Every structure is written in C-alpha cells, then in structure tokens.
Design a protein around this ligand. Sequence first.
Ligand SMILES: *C(=O)/C=C/c1ccc(O)cc1
Length: 125
Amino acid sequence: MEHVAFGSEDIENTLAKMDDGQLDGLAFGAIQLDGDGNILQYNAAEGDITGRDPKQVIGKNFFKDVAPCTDSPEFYGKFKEGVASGNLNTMFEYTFDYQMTPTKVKVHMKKALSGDSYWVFVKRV
Ligand SMILES: *C(=O)/C=C/c1ccc(O)cc1
C-alpha cells in the first residue's frame, strides 16, 4: 500500500511524487482531471469501485462521456467554479449510477499542486 489517508490536509503535496503505478497503491479512488474535465490519471482503486478499466478512460471527458450522472450543479457545477476561481477544496457524498449498480461514495475534489489539474478522490460509504 501507499499510506496516505483520504482527506489529508496536504494530500496534493504527497500525490505530486506518484507515477501511475504508485497511484494504484492508494486505499481510495483517485482521478486527475485537466481544467476541461478530461481524465489524465485514473487509479486501480477507482476502477474497483466503478467497473471502468483505467487505461480505457484516460483521455475521455469525465463529465461528458464517462460520468454523465455528475453533470449537475452538485458535482460538475462545483468543479467548474473551482477551475474558474483557481481554488477548489470540497467534500460531499454522491451516488454513482450510470451503467452500474447505484453506489454511494464520499468525494473529495481538490486542486493539484500543479497548475491546471484537479483531483477527484473517492471512497465508499
Ligand atoms: C455517474 O455517471 C458516475 C459515473 C462514474 C463515476 C466515477 C467513475 O470513476 C466512473 C464513472
């Protein structure tokens, strides 16, 4: 395992050192998005939660293509305000229900330490 707790205050500094292989050792799902919502990184734990194959969703748009259930003011709306503002740090519960059994999760969205990238972290509840 990589030992990093979900919700940790300095998580963006810790994850700045990991490559795709290290990200697969986290105890929670991790997605890195660009400012348009395209998927740059997608770890093994996220694929275990949602059924998606990580290598197949990299490059797709999360809000348009992969996760239309998140295209709502409650999820995408928060993301886009964060990108526009250049700051984002929010945690909320959500249900993922597209082409899968409805699954309740906790989501943490946080701006990355690098400029135009954003993390989405997911764990079951
Ligand atoms: C709603 O459409 C949610 C879909 C979804 C969430 C998270 C993922 O990693 C993949 C699909």
